[PDB]
Structure formats: structure tokens, C-alpha cells
């Protein structure tokens, strides 16, 4: 299990040490990262990630890439992260229909940053191989009673009003143009 | 309102039908306009059986030179079939008391006008009369629930 | 047969012995080991001038074997072999004062002694067993019983032999032995004595007539076995039913009645039964007859074993088929309540045989109903009777046991039975439907060395331990508060006198609002027991014996487990009170009027509630301001008068904005906010308008439009071929929530108001499933339908009228269910719009096609349908087969615990405790705040807080936790939790458990896929195994502050 530092299909195992919880007497969360090949203009400089931990967000992605850069004295500036639908609540685009699960894309500012972080993560895999305790610790941004009561918190009337207003407005516009074109 | 149960100087009632008033009906029947009636016998949940009524008159188009404004039988036939359609939908859906709650704000009267206005104008449009002819069995429990 | 012929040879070998006196026979059977099983009261030397004798008796066969209609009984049958006495041994003054009875007793004593000697000669004694018994448990008639144990070794036949000694045809005068006649001088009639002696006088002739009718008809034997097996499943037999025993009618009486029906039957004496009928024809005819033709109170039947049968309009207040050819009442072993309950069973079987839509054979013939008394009967109380001694009765029993008492109830068994029977029956009246009494401990057999049976347990010297009283109650007349008496005049009438006497201190005189002056007696209901229980307690300990002990701790614990709302006088508030529901309805109807008088760009078409509180099924009864209740905000489908999903949903929300604006404007007493609703898939704009009413109540409003289902079907059509089933599932959920929900709540309300106890039974069932954590997967409507199944389909039983009976019937049905092969289709309708056979065939073909495309329920386990849903899927989808099998195993282990450990409060607590086993992981959590008081179940809230975010603060998040966690790991993990903390959270209502199982496929290692959808840890460079510790750590991260403990596999 120690010499398993990468996969034959080109992907890479990423360990992560998990801390001591009182209810348990340390695992190392495995992730896989592979550079992307997509012809979409906004799908450039992407690291396809597989098996993100719970609530892997841009903050912890910046934290991880900063860990890698601080270690390997490298520069890897993250740009954005895509397709983080960790619960599967947008699997079907019903809207335009009637008009990559557990994986994601990690966009960087440039191929420079992406190749640099790619080297850093190759050497992270080699850390898994040789020195298992030089591997980072993944801290989940901990959801508490506060964010769950946030989920329970009712919506804001001003947000409701403004969103409905602009949505109905642009929809009336597009519909007017559609009717013009149809009966023109 | 029919009396079904009693309890010492306090006797309760339930639904037993609905009528219009004779004076109101006479005024509605104006000359030079088509009258239209339709009716259906239909069941509810709490299996009362009833026959409900419906009447409507062709109205003049607000700009119309010709006074008579009479539909076309083909018009009439279609209107009754839709009214008949809408009434059977309301009666089956309503348990019995719910139809009661349905009639009072006259939603029926409007869905009619709505599905209708694509055939021919029409004015008034009311349920007009509903009668009961086969009620199920007492069930003292159900009657108590309606009373508060 | 060979053995019986050897027995006849043995008897013809048996010698005869002459006239002897009591002292002579006393010395005889004192120096012989056999003790004469004398019939009480024994003969006495001072009142015995006649003498004794035995000669060769008259051998014959009789019974189902003679009728050749016996079957292969698993437990074992017996063949009756009659041996009547010599008419020369008989004198014309022997049918008075136990003379012929002592004759029979000494006859049989010598008979068994010397057949025992012939047994000691023939050497069958090493495997043959000889003993005494009573002819169908009649103490006035002792009989001999021959059995065997493991060349006449007949034990593998499981049979037995009955040696009876009746009397010859017409020895004593049948009109001097008519039930009206007295023959025990001390004047009251001796009906039981009359019956015993005259039946013993004319046994065989009835067998002659039975065989004659069997030769005159064709399907007679088949009808015989049909009736026998029907009765046997019903728990009925021919034994004496006067002794706290359900019986008096078995195969013999059934056959005699069938022959008499072939001999007539109508009131016009005409032939209702025709000899050309078939088996089913004859059986349906006889059941229809016993269901339509009273035989006890207002009419009775008449026939002649030698003339056509005729029904007459005189009921002798006792089941009376009167043979004139012998001057005998056939059913003389039958109690009146026994006849009543049998007639009710007859009507039930008639209606079953008249069911044209569903088959009923399996329920009619292939289900034993007499296995669990608390299923067979709604109410049942245990009463220890320490009555003591024959002389100690004068100080133990309130009533008297004198000369006429014993002449009427020859047996104190009959006396006590009928006494408590009548006192409970009167003191209860219309509060019940049917009564039975069971003398717990009673027996029938005893060795030959005895004079009768002997018992010394339970503070008695008679055959019983205690008394269990069973009742089929009337629910509509159960929880009636006051026991109403007769009217009041100055000259106190006989009825009012007897009433006031019977009721002693409880009696009084109350006046009513209408202006009536009648006696009565009042009670005060209790939320832990029924007023029927209070009444039986009082009357039993008053008019029977001050030493009786009474209880039903079982029903006590049932009502205790029932949730008790934090409401004033809830302690005295019974189960059948729906005042809380009515108050919620009234507040809602006020709000209804407000919105209907509102004005909008549309006219409000309809406002239909679909709340579980509305349909009388919520786990708890609502409490004002108790908003921490999961079932606080009831759903209210709002629908307005008559093209894209997002614009449509946002228009819905805009209408809610307008409503909320006008409501805050001109109904400031109410509070309002908007909640994001995400229970429906792939719709990210649905907003429910939550409304708060100073009646402390909360609703959520959602605009329904037809364009919803329109656009949904459009999307169904436009979706890709592989994408289709997902949107199918989403549309199914939508339909379940928006249309079938309304239809269901309507019809369920109606049928519940017709079946009162349905609401408490389904509430208890929901409680039980919450304790078992299955509620996270089960949708309410599903459980509601399952628990309504017994009422709407009671076969073979009766409609439950007690929370215990209903709960147990629900569990019995679920346990015996086989959802893989068996469907469920309910006729939601009041008692006697049912499904046409056409709709039935449609639902069945639906079920068959579904089980074809799914023969093992990987996609759908339980299938239940009705008029509201011809699909049978709307409340059953989205349930994993592990959950299904866990539910069925729960039901089965519960039924087995009931089968084994006996029904007690301990077994009930074992039912309610959760198994918590087989769980790959179990996380034990506790919430920081207490919530039992806030949830409003009794251990109180009194307003709404000033912040709605703080409403949410007091709310409960563990539901959100488990739901979203299942949404994430739904590819790999199956979870369960507790929904109702206010009942399943300990003493504060604050403890929950997250119990989870691993998907057995992802249990192992697999190919590393781009869409494998799990937290894995490879075992090699290509194959990936699941990451258990990572999973547990992620659960801990998600529930950091509320996870208190974790326990792994």
C-alpha cells in the first residue's frame, strides 16, 4: 500500500492524513489528478481531479496548492475550479431541456502554473512512496450548527424581489424578440 | 340545510342543496340573446349523488353593431359539452363539503368563462341550481367533523 | 377397523354383573384400582334405594368416521363407539335425581375395569393408554378414552377411541325431558340435565338420519368436511360452551343442521336446500342460512328426524333447532354469546363468498384465527379469582349458590361463567358488541383412578386458574363518557329499580340541556386506559366477589407508549379525541377565508390542505407554538384560476410575494417568510410561503399550476433516451406531492371518520417505525396505507376496535406479507365505489408487468394501489431492498417474540427498542439543546420568537444532515436516522443515532473509473477499494459538533 504512489492509467493517488477524532482510536485521503484535454476555451489549463474530500472549495484548493508551492519552491497560481456539484443537485438541466460525478476541473492562470503544480504533485506522489509523513493534512471546512441553521434560515425579501424583477424582465425581452422573429 | 342530528336545545345541519332566487333568474332572461343550460348527475367522495346545473347567455361584443348576438347551435353544443366537462371534473374531485367550499367563491363560474371565451362571448354564467337525490349512510362521525 | 373389531370381541367377552347396592359397588371399586368417576353430586347411601347393574351393552359406531367424512387430522381425531344400556336394566323412575346418571357411571366404571383386565390378558397394555374424559367436556357425561403410544399399534394413525354409554331409543319420556321440564326434585327447569339424558337416550337415531341424508344427497361428505374445517379455523367445536368455552357447534351439529336444511329450512317450511346442489352450493346455503336466520331470540327452527323442517318466529332465548321426532334441542351446548359470534362469522363468510372481485378461499379455509387471543379479540382482561372452597363460596362470592342455583347450573363452572358473563354484559351494554369468557386453567381429562377432575391452583378447588374476559367492542359506542340509565318517574319503575340496584353508589339522577330526567352513572376518561376497563373493574369487583383481581397492563403500556401532547387535561383526554385536529382545522379555515377575500391579479381558484395533521395521521397531535415539531408546517396546495420552468416558478414566487405583501399589510397578526424548497429534484426556484398564526400554528403555501405537469411532460419527451428514467422518477415524486397527495388526504379523512381507530393505530405505527429509524426512507403515505390495510380488509378477522388489536393486526399482515410475489390493492371505501373487476384486472396486469420487468424488486419491493393510484408505485419508489427486508425481518421477529415470550409489557418494550445491529457504522449524537418541551410532548412554548432565523435556531438539523449525506454517498452508502427527536431522544428528546450500511458491491475493490463515485483507496495501481476510515472521518467532519460517538463494524 506504501509503494502504490500512482496508477497505471495515468492518474495519481494523493494521500491525506486525517486527525485524531475522540470517537476513533490515521488514514490519508487519496486523490487523483490528471491534466485536461478539452477544446472549450474556458476549459484550458485544467487539472481533472477525482475523489475530492467533502466540500472541497476554492479556498482549500488554494491552501493545497500553496502547500505544494511552499514545499517545492514552485509557483502555481490557481485561477478557478469547475464542476463542484458535490451533491448532484444539477445533474439534469431541466430548464433548457424544456425551453464527471465526484470529479472536478481545477483551472489555473496558465500552463506555467499547471505544469509547476503537476511537478509538485508528482513529487507529492513520491512523498507517498518514500516519506508518508511529509504529506499534507486535509482539514474539511467544518460544517456546524451555524451553517446548518444557515441552511434553515429563510430567504431575504430584497433578494427575492430583485431576482424575480430582473429575471422576469430579461425573459419578457427574449420572448418579445422570439414572437417578433416567429411572426415576422 | 337539512337537520340530521340533535343534542338538547341544539340541533345541527348539513348540506341539502342549492337554488337561485326567482326574481334574479327572471331579470337574467333578457330578449335578443341565446340562453344556454347544461347539467350532469355526478358522484362525490363521501358518496352523495347530485345533479348540478349551469346557465349562461351570449353577450354582445362591446363594439358590435348587431343587437341579437346569437351563437350558432354548433356554438351551443360545444359550450354545453365543455361546461359538462368542467362540472363532472369538479363533482368527482369534491368529496361533498369541498364542492360546497368550491361553489361559494364561484371558481366554477370562472373556469367556464375561461374555457368558453374561445368559442363565443357569454355573460352571467352561474351554477344556478344543485339538488341532492342519493345520500350514503348517516355516519354520525362525519357529520360531527363539519361542525366546529 | 381391525382394532375396533378386536374391541367388540373383547366386549362380547366382558361378563355381566348384577343388581348391587351402593355399599357393594363401593367395596368393589375400593378393592379394585379403578375409581368410579361419579358425577357430582355423588350418590349418597341415604338417598339410594335403587341399585346397580352392567350387562353386555349395545355396540355401534357414530361420528365423522361413521359418516366416512373424517380427515387426516395433524393433531388427531377420535371415533365415537356407543354402548347403550339394557332397557331391562332401566326402570321407568330412573330419569329423576341422577338415578340413570349413577347407572351410567357404574356401568362405565365396571366396563373400563374389566376391559383393563382383558387388556392385561391380551398384552396390548405396553403401548395402549386408557383414561377418562367427558363427552365433549360435559361433566354430566363421563366417557372412556383409548389412546396409543409409539399388532394393533394404531398410534401412527394419531386417532383415538371414545367409549360412550348412552341409553336406548325412547326409554324415558322425551316430553318429560323437554328443556322446560324439571327432573331434579328439591320448580325450575333443568335444561342441561334434560339435554344430557335425552341425548344419551337418542344418540344413534341421529346417526341413522345423518347417514340417510348422506345417502340421499351427493356432496354431503364434502360439505361436512367444508364446515368442519371452516369451524376449525374459526376455533369452534361441539363441546359444551356454557363453561367459559367457545363451542357448542362442531361437525356433528353442522351435519344435523345441513340434513334438516335438506329437510326444509324456511319459515314457510319450504325446501331452501335442494338435494341437487353441489358442495359449494350446500355450504354457501347453510352459511347464508345461519347468517340470516336467528335461532335464539326472535325465532327458532323445527324438524323431525323421521315432517319437513319449518322455521318458527319464536326464539327460546337459546339456540333452538327443535327435533320433534325426539323432542330435543340440538344446540343445547351453546351459550347465547357463542351463537351470536357464530352468526357474525356466518355473515362474514357469506359476504366473503359473495366477493366477486377478489378471491376469499385462502382467508376462509386456510387461516387459523384462534391463535392470538388479542388478535381474535379487541379487548381482554385478566382477573385472578381466588374463590376457594365449596363452603368458602359463601364468603368469597357476592352472589348465592343454592339449591335452584345448582339445579340450573349443575356445575359451579356453568354458574360462575354465566354469572360474570351476565354481569359484564349488562354493566357494559352498548359499549361492546360481543362478549366471551375463558376459564384459564380448565381441563377435560383425568386418569381412571379418580372420581372427577381435581384442581388446587389459583385460590380454587375447581378447574381453572383465573378468568380472561374477551370483548369485541363497538368503537362508536366505546369512549362514550356516561353510562346512561332509564328515565325517571315518581313511581320507580322495575327497570329503574333494577338499574339503581345494580349500579349502587355509581347510580344518580342527572338532568340534561334538552330537559330530560334519567338516571345514569358517570366516569372520567383516562389517557392510559379505557372507560370500559374502569367499568369492568368496578362491576366485577362489586357484584361478583370482593377478592377478584383485575388488569390489562398490556393495553396500559400501549396507551402509555402513545404520545401524550402537552395539552391541558390531556391526562384525562382519551385516544378518540380529535379536538387538537379540529382546532388546527379551524385556525386554517380562518386563514382560508382571509386569503379567499384577498384580491390578486388572479382570482384564487382553490386552497386545499394536504397536511398529515389534516388527514389525522401525524405522529403527534399538533400543539400551538410547538414549532420544533417536524410536522409543524402543514402543506397547503394553493391553486389559482386558469412556458419555461424557471420563469413559471419565479412567477409562482411573485404571486407569493403579492400575497405576503397584502397579508403583512392587512393581517399583521400573522407572521410570514419565504423558504427555499428543495425536496423536489432539479427545481432550484420553488419557494414555500410559511405563515404563522396566533393560534400558534404554521403552514406552508405553494402555488400549483397545470403548466407544472404540462412542462414536466414536455421535458420528459425532450430528454435523452438514457436520461429518461431519471426525469420519470422526478415527475413521479412531483405527482406524489401535488395531486395524488390531495386525493389521498381527502379519501383517507373520509374512511377514517368511518373507521375511528385508524388514526391512533397509524399514529402508533409511525411511532414504532420512528423508533426503528426506517422513517428516513419510508414516506408517511406509504405507512398510512399499510396500517389502513387491516380495517379496509379485515379478512378473516373483525375490524379492530382497540389500539393493541389494530397494531398487532398491522404487524401480522406485514410479517406474513410477500411483496416479491404478492401485490396489495385496497378498496378505500366506507363499510357496507369499490373497484370494478375491470379496474381490478387492470391493477393486476399492472402488477404482473411490473414484476415481469422486475421479478426481484431491485427497483420496487412493496406494491400497493387503490383508486387514487392505479400505478401501485407512487408511495413505494425510492426504497432500497435492504430497507425492505429489514422491515419485513422486524415484523417477523416481532411476531415470533409474541409467539414465544407471551404478551407482556416487556415484550412490548422489546418491540419498541431498536436493534441497532447489522449496522456497518453507528454514530451516536446528542443535540446541544433540549427539545421535548418545545416539541410539546408531555414530559411549554407560549409565543413565536422575534426572529425567524431564530425559529430556525430552535429547529432540528439532524434531518438535513442525514438527507444531504445520503445525497452525497447515495452511490455508496445507505443510511437511517430518527426523524422525531421529541419522542425518540431520551428524557430531553435530544439523542439520535445515524446507522449506516455499506453497499455490498463497493464493499470490495474495483476498477478505477472516472465515474466510480466513491471515496476509495487503491489496493494496486489499477484496482481501487473503498476508503472506510476516510468515510468515517468525513461523517465526523460533517457533523463535527453534534457527533458524540462513533462505533464501527
Curated annotation (Swiss-Prot), chain A:
Compartments where located: Nucleus, Nucleolus
GO CC annotation: CURI complex; nucleolus; nucleoplasm; nucleus; small-subunit processome; UTP-C complex
Keywords noted in UniProt: Nucleus, Ribosome biogenesis, rRNA processing
Gene Ontology molecular function, alphabetical: rRNA binding
Domain of life assignment: Eukaryota
Any one GO biological process: ribosomal small subunit assembly
Subunit field text: Component of the 90S pre-ribosomal particle.
Function summary: Plays an important role in the synthesis of 18S rRNA but is not required for the 5.8S and 25S pathway. Is necessary for the cleavage at site A2. Is required for efficient association of RPS27 with the pre-ribosomal particle.
Protein family membership: Belongs to the RRP7 family.
Protein name as it appears in the record: Ribosomal RNA-processing protein 7
Organism: Saccharomyces cerevisiae (strain ATCC 204508 / S288c) (Baker's yeast)
From Swiss-Prot, chain B:
UniProt KW keywords: Acetylation, Cytoplasm, Isopeptide bond, Phosphoprotein, Ribonucleoprotein, Ribosomal protein, Ubl conjugation
Protein's UniProt keywords contain Acetylation: yes
Membrane spanning residue stretches: none
Molecular function as annotated in GO: structural constituent of ribosome
GO CC list: 90S preribosome; cytosol; cytosolic small ribosomal subunit
Post-translational modification as stated in the protein's UniProt record: N-terminally acetylated by acetyltransferase NatA.
Localization: Cytoplasm
Stated role: Component of the ribosome, a large ribonucleoprotein complex responsible for the synthesis of proteins in the cell. The small ribosomal subunit (SSU) binds messenger RNAs (mRNAs) and translates the encoded message by selecting cognate aminoacyl-transfer RNA (tRNA) molecules. The large subunit (LSU) contains the ribosomal catalytic site termed the peptidyl transferase center (PTC), which catalyzes the formation of peptide bonds, thereby polymerizing the amino acids delivered by tRNAs into a polypeptide chain.
Family: Belongs to the eukaryotic ribosomal protein eS1 family.
Additional free-text comment from the UniProt record: Present with 92400 molecules/cell in log phase SD medium. There are 2 genes for eS1 in yeast.
Protein name: Small ribosomal subunit protein eS1A
Species assigned in the record: Saccharomyces cerevisiae (strain ATCC 204508 / S288c) (Baker's yeast)
Residues of the full protein shown: 86 to 233 of 255
From Swiss-Prot, chain C:
Pfam families associated with the record: Nrap (PF03813), Nrap_D2 (PF17403), Nrap_D3 (PF17404), Nrap_D4 (PF17405), Nrap_D5 (PF17406), Nrap_D6 (PF17407)
Gene Ontology CC entries for this record: 90S preribosome; CURI complex; nucleolus; nucleoplasm; nucleus; small-subunit processome; UTP-C complex
Domain of life (superkingdom): Eukaryota
Subcellular location: Nucleus, Nucleolus
Keyword 4Fe-4S: no
GO BP field: maturation of SSU-rRNA; nucleolar large rRNA transcription by RNA polymerase I; regulation of ribosomal protein gene transcription by RNA polymerase II; ribosomal small subunit assembly; rRNA processing; tRNA export from nucleus
Primary localization class, coarse: nucleus
Coiled coil regions in record: none
Keyword presence, Transferase: no
Family: Belongs to the NRAP family.
Note: Present with 3260 molecules/cell in log phase SD medium.
Record's function text: Involved in nucleolar processing of pre-18S ribosomal RNA and ribosome assembly.
Record-given protein name: U3 small nucleolar RNA-associated protein 22
Originating organism: Saccharomyces cerevisiae (strain ATCC 204508 / S288c)
Amino acid at each position: 500500500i506504501e509503494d502504490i504512489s500512482a496508477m497505471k492509467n495515468g492518474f495519481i493517488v494523493v494521500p491525506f492524513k486525517l486527525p485524531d477524532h475522540k470517537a476513533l482510536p490515521a488514514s490519508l485521503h487519496f486523490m487523483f489528478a490528471k491534466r485536461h484535454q478539452s477544446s472549450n476555451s474556458n476549459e484550458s489549463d485544467c487539472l481533472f481531479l477525482v475523489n475530492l474530500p467533502l466540500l472541497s472549495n476554492i479556498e482549500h484548493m488554494k491552501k493545497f496548492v500553496g502547500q505544494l508551492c511552499g514545499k517545492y519552491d514552485t509557483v502555481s497560481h490557481v485561477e478557478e475550479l469547475l464542476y463542484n456539484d458535490e451533491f448532484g443537485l444539477h445533474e439534469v438541466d431541466l430548464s433548457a431541456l424544456t425551453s464527471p460525478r465526484n470529479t472536478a476541473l481545477l483551472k489555473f492562470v496558465d500552463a506555467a502554473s499547471i505544469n509547476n503544480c503537476w511537478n509538485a504533485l508528482k513529487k507529492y506522489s513520491n512523498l507517498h512512496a518514500k516519506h508518508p509523513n511529509e504529506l499534507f493534512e486535509w482539514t474539511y471546512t467544518t460544517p456546524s450548527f451555524t451553517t446548518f441553521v444557515n441552511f434553515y434560515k429563510p430567504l431575504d425579501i430584497d433578494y427575492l424581489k430583485e431576482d424575480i424583477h430582473t429575471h422576469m424582465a430579461i425573459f419578457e425581452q427574449r420572448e418579445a424578440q422570439a414572437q417578433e422573429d416567429v411572426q415576422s | 340545510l337539512r337537520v340530521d342530528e340533535v343534542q338538547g336545545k341544539n340541533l345541527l345541519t348539513n348540506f341539502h342543496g342549492m337554488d337561485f332566487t326567482t326574481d334574479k333568474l327572471r331579470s337574467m332572461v333578457r330578449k335578443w340573446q341565446t340562453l344556454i343550460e347544461a347539467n350532469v348527475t355526478v358522484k362525490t367522495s363521501d358518496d352523495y349523488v347530485l345533479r348540478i346545473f349551469a346557465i349562461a347567455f351570449t353577450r354582445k361584443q362591446a363594439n358590435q353593431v348587431k343587437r341579437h348576438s346569437y351563437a350558432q347551435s354548433s356554438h351551443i353544443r360545444a359550450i354545453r359539452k365543455v361546461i359538462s366537462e368542467i362540472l363532472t371534473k369538479e363533482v368527482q374531485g369534491s368529496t361533498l363539503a369541498q364542492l360546497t367550499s368550491k361553489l361559494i367563491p364561484e371558481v366554477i363560474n370562472k373556469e367556464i368563462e375561461n374555457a368558453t371565451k374561445d368559442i363565443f362571448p357569454l355573460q352571467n354564467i352561474h351554477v344556478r341550481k344543485v339538488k341532492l337525490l342519493k345520500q350514503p349512510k348517516f355516519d354520525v362521525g362525519a357529520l360531527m367533523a363539519l361542525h366546529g | 377397523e381391525k382394532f375396533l373389531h378386536k374391541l367388540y370381541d373383547i366386549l362380547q367377552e366382558i361378563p355381566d354383573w348384577e343388581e348391587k347396592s351402593l355399599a357393594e359397588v363401593d367395596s368393589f371399586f375400593k378393592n379394585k384400582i379403578v375409581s368410579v368417576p361419579f358425577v357430582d353430586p355423588k350418590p349418597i347411601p341415604q338417598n339410594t334405594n335403587y341399585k346397580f347393574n352392567y350387562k353386555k351393552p349395545d355396540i355401534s359406531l357414530i361420528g365423522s368416521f361413521a359418516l366416512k367424512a373424517g380427515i387426516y387430522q395433524p393433531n388427531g381425531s377420535s371415533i365415537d363407539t356407543l354402548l347403550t344400556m339394557p332397557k331391562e336394566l332401566f326402570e321407568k323412575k330412573d330419569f329423576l335425581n341422577f338415578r340413570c346418571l349413577h347407572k351410567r357411571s357404574v356401568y362405565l366404571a365396571y366396563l373400563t375395569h374389566h376391559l383393563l383386565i382383558l387388556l392385561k390378558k391380551d398384552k396390548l397394555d405396553s403401548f395402549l393408554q386408557l383414561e377418562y374424559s367427558y363427552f365433549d367436556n360435559d361433566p354430566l357425561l363421563p366417557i372412556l378414552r383409548i389412546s396409543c403410544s409409539k399388532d394393533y399399534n394404531f398410534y401412527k394413525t394419531r386417532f383415538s377411541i371414545n367409549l360412550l354409554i348412552g341409553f336406548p331409543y325412547k326409554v324415558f319420556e322425551p316430553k318429560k325431558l323437554l328443556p322446560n321440564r324439571n327432573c331434579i326434585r328439591i320448580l325450575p327447569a333443568t335444561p342441561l340435565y334434560n339435554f344430557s339424558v335425552l341425548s344419551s337416550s337418542t344418540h344413534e337415531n341421529y346417526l341413522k338420519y345423518l347417514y340417510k341424508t348422506k345417502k340421499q344427497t351427493e356432496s354431503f361428505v364434502e360439505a361436512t368436511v367444508l364446515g368442519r374445517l371452516w369451524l376449525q379455523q374459526r376455533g369452534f367445536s361441539s363441546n359444551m360452551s356454557h363453561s367459559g368455552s367457545l363451542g357448542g357447534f362442531g361437525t356433528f351439529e353442522f351435519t344435523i343442521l345441513m340434513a334438516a336444511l335438506l329437510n326444509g329450512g324456511g319459515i314457510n317450511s319450504n325446501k331452501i336446500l335442494l338435494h341437487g346442489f353441489s358442495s359449494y352450493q350446500l355450504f354457501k346455503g347453510v352459511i347464508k342460512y345461519l347468517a340470516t336466520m336467528d335461532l335464539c331470540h326472535d325465532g327458532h327452527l323445527q324438524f323431525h328426524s323421521n315432517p319437513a323442517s319449518k322455521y318458527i318466529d319464536e326464539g327460546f332465548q337459546t339456540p333452538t333447532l327443535f327435533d320433534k321426532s325426539t323432542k330435543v334441542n340440538i344446540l343445547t351446548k351453546m351459550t347465547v354469546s357463542s351463537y351470536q359470534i357464530l352468526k357474525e362469522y356466518a355473515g362474514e363468510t357469506l359476504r366473503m363468498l359473495n366477493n366477486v372481485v377478489q378471491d376469499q378461499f385462502s382467508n376462509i379455509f386456510l387461516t387459523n384465527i384462534s391463535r392470538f387471543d388479542n388478535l381474535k379479540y379487541d379487548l381482554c382482561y385478566d382477573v385472578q379469582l381466588p374463590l376457594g372452597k365449596y363452603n368458602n363460596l359463601e364468603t368469597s362470592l357476592a352472589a348465592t349458590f343454592g339449591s335452584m342455583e345448582r339445579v340450573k347450573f349443575i356445575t359451579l363452572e356453568n354458574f360462575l361463567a354465566h354469572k360474570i358473563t351476565n354481569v359484564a354484559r349488562y354493566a357494559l351494554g352498548d359499549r361492546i358488541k360481543y362478549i366471551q369468557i375463558e376459564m384459564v386453567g380448565q381441563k377435560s381429562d383425568f386418569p381412571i383412578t379418580k372420581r372427577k377432575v381435581y384442581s388446587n391452583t389459583g385460590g380454587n378447588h375447581f378447574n381453572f386458574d383465573f378468568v380472561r374476559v374477551k370483548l369485541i367492542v363497538n368503537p362508536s359506542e366505546c369512549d362514550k363518557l356516561v353510562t346512561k340509565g332509564p328515565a325517571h318517574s315518581e313511581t320507580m319503575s322495575t327497570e329503574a329499580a333494577v338499574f339503581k340496584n345494580f349500579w349502587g353508589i355509581k347510580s344518580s339522577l342527572r338532568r340534561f340541556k334538552d330537559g330530560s330526567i334519567t338516571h345514569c352513572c358517570v366516569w372520567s376518561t383516562s389517557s392510559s386506559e379505557p372507560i370500559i376497563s374502569s367499568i369492568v373493574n368496578f362491576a366485577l369487583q362489586k357484584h361478583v366477589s370482593k377478592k377478584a383481581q383485575i388488569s390489562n397492563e398490556t393495553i396500559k403500556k400501549f396507551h402509555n407508549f402513545l404520545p401524550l401532547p402537552n395539552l391541558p387535561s390531556s391526562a384525562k383526554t382519551s385516544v378518540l379525541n380529535l379536538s387538537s385536529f379540529f382546532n388546527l382545522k379551524k385556525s386554517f379555515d380562518d386563514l382560508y377565508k382571509i386569503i379567499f377575500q384577498m384580491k390578486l391579479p388572479l382570482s384564487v381558484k382553490s386552497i386545499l390542505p394536504v397536511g398529515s395533521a389534516f388527514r389525522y395521521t401525524s405522529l403527534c397531535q399538533p400543539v400551538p407554538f410547538a414549532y420544533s415539531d417536524p410536522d409543524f408546517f402543514q402543506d397547503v396546495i394553493l391553486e389559482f384560476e386558469t412556458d419555461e420552468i424557471t420563469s413559471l416558478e419565479k412567477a409562482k414566487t411573485a404571486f407569493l410575494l403579492k400575497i405576503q405583501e397584502e397579508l403583512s399589510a392587512n393581517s399583521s397578526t400573522y407572521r410570514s417568510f419565504f423558504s427555499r424548497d428543495e425536496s423536489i429534484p432539479y427545481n432550484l426556484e420553488i419557494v414555500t410561503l410559511n405563515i404563522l398564526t396566533p393560534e400558534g400554528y404554521g403552514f406552508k403555501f405553494r402555488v400549483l399550476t397545470e403548466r407544472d405537469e404540462i412542462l414536466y411532460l414536455r421535458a420528459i419527451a425532450n430528454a435523452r433516451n438514457e436520461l429518461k428514467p431519471e426525469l420519470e422518477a422526478t415527475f413521479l415524486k412531483f405527482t406524489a406531492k401535488y395531486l395524488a397527495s390531495v386525493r389521498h388526504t381527502r379519501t383517507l379523512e373520509n374512511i377514517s371518520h368511518s373507521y375511528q381507530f385508524y388514526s391512533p393505530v397509524v399514529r402508533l405505527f409511525k411511532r414504532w417505525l420512528d423508533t426503528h429509524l426506517l422513517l428516513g426512507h419510508i414516506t408517511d403515505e406509504l405507512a398510512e396505507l399499510i396500517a389502513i390495510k387491516p380495517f379496509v380488509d379485515p379478512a378473516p378477522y373483525f375490524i379492530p376496535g382497540s389500539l393493541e388489536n389494530g397494531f398487532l393486526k398491522v404487524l401480522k399482515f406485514i410479517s406474513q406479507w410477500n411483496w416479491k410475489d404478492d401485490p396489495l390493492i385496497l378498496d378505500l371505501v366506507k363499510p357496507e365505489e369499490r373497484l370494478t373487476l375491470a379496474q381490478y384486472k387492470g391493477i393486476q396486469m399492472n402488477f404482473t408487468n411490473l414484476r415481469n420487468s422486475d421479478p426481484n424488486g431491485t427497483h420496487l419491493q412493496f406494491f400497493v394501489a387503490s383508486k387514487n393510484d392505479p400505478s401501485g408505485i407512487l408511495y413505494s419508489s425510492g426504497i432500497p431492498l435492504p430497507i425492505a427486508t429489514r422491515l419485513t425481518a422486524l415484523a417477523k421477529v416481532a411476531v415470533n417474540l409474541l409467539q414465544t415470550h407471551g404478551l407482556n409489557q416487556q415484550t412490548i418494550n422489546l418491540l419498541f427498542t431498536p436493534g441497532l445491529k447489522d449496522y456497518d457504522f453507528v454514530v451516536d449524537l446528542r443535540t446541544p439543546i433540549g427539545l421535548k418541551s418545545s416539541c410539546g410532548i408531555l414530559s411549554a412554548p407560549s409565543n413565536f420568537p422575534e426572529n425567524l432565523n431564530d425559529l430556525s435556531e430552535k429547529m432540528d438539523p439532524t434531518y438535513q444532515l442525514v438527507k444531504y449525506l445520503n445525497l452525497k454517498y447515495k452511490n455508496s452508502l445507505i443510511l437511517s436516522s430518527r426523524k422525531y427527536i421529541g419522542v425518540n431522544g431520551g428524557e430531553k428528546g435530544d439523542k439520535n443515532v445515524i446507522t449506516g450500511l455499506i453497499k455490498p458491491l463497493f464493499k470490495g475493490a474495483h476498477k478505477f473509473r472516472v465515474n466510480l463515485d466513491c471515496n476509495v483507496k487503491p489496493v494496486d495501481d489499477e484496482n481501487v477499494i473503498l476508503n472506510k476510515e476516510a468515510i468515517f472521518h468525513e461523517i465526523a467532519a460533517f457533523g463535527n459538533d453534534m457527533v458524540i460517538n462513533f462505533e464501527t463494524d
